[PDB]
Amino acid sequence: APALTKSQTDRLEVLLNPKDESGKPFRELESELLSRRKKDLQQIYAEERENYLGKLEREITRFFVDRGFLEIKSPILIPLEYIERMGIDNDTELSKQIFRVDKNFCLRPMLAPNLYNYLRKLDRALPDPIKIFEIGPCYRKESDGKEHLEEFTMLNFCQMGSGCTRENLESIITDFLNHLGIDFKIVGVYGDTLDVMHGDLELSSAVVGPIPLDREWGIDKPWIGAGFGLERLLKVKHDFKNIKRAARSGSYYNGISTNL
Amino acid sequence: APALTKSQTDRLEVLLNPKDESGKPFRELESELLSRRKKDLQQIYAEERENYLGKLEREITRFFVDRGFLEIKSPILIPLEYIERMGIDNDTELSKQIFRVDKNFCLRPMLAPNLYNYLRKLDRALPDPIKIFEIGPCYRKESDGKEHLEEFTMLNFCQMGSGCTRENLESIITDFLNHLGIDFKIVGVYGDTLDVMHGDLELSSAVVGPIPLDREWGIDKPWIGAGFGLERLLKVKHDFKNIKRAARSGSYYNGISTNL
Structure with a gap:
């Protein structure tokens, strides 16, 4: 061809959208996709102008707020x-996977600690049951088959x-994903932990407490809860072949390359 | 009294809302405010359920998207x-004020570097003029009269x-703040830098380029731009006496104490 x-x-590949559908040389093949991508950015810029990550967050948020959960925005930089x-x-x-800052703080690898503190504190002012949620940045150092940001x-x-109850947790999870339009399968001995899967990809590990850990945070009460990665959801929803297309990046915008 | x-x-003070309006002992005075705060949280929980920081971000966002700016969500953890x-x-x-992570990265103290990279990259695909914006976390170590988070x-x-043009930059800034309902005053030799003030509080330092720095990032073109701190805007809007009431916190929720 050669x-x-x-x-x-x-x-x-970098210039390839899932939607895109031999002989021609590299030059023309690249020159073709380059104008397509530029046209894609021009459409975004002309009509919507919303970022996928931001927009999903706004949509996930309307979802939970609309049905009783209090929106939390706790610290990203937490105490070790x-x-x-x-x-x-x-x-x-x-x-070692935790990103440290000073001999005291670090980058929150998960939202749990801060929600625990909120459950405890809010239980003294809010009626039963106490419903909350938080959408935000998290940090974990990776290795191996790094399909992890x-x-x-x-x-x-x-x-x-x-x-x-695990019946209710499963229901929230189900309404949630059918709302977003993401195909998934739930799978679950005791210490009830649920795994919401999409294909062979883990969408989230859910937990039906109480659990021995609860006591360290002053909880001691029943509770259910699930964690999801927005980028993974976007990878799936938009069929991105690489999770990095849905990450905060300088290299991609809404899954379109910015190196044109 | 005593x-x-x-x-x-x-x-x-911690239990005091700006809105709140001698003799009585500490016990009753505290017990009074405690039920008020709990009632405030109960109202939030019952009706809206939206966090101030999150909500402002959503409102700031509709503002700029509605008028031509592309929504950016770049990395929070950037290269030193x-x-x-x-x-x-x-x-x-x-x-020294920068929070480092590894012998390479750090916590973005400002949004500039990542927007610069975007201006360069997007200029090769978007029509003139190129309008963008980003709302997100930033990090700076403080000292002195720490009215800084x-x-x-x-x-x-x-x-x-x-x-x-400085005329247009001033206009965006003005529509923006009148939209939010925040009183401000603009003040400005060459290398045109504007300071948007609210009382004696600096709401933002704006910049009318180009500026010598532009070249390091591959810009070389005219541009205008302003940076604002959402917490400061909230402090002002909600009349919080301490900026920490508007920060991501475990101690306050929408300016209401969580230690009830």
């Missing part, structure tokens, strides 16, 4: 002491008090 | 090299190409 080299193939009290003693391996966006919703 | 001690005064190229060589004092939320909008 056969495109791997490098040229990779370059073309919070991570230990979660069961990740400096001994565990996950301890180091800077990702999490959605953690939870309820405490009445109705905290 | 005179409330400072400590009791501080404790009561980006900070230097901004003019903050390891020598400068501000260099270390973890704050920034709004940086900018335009490149046609219309980049």
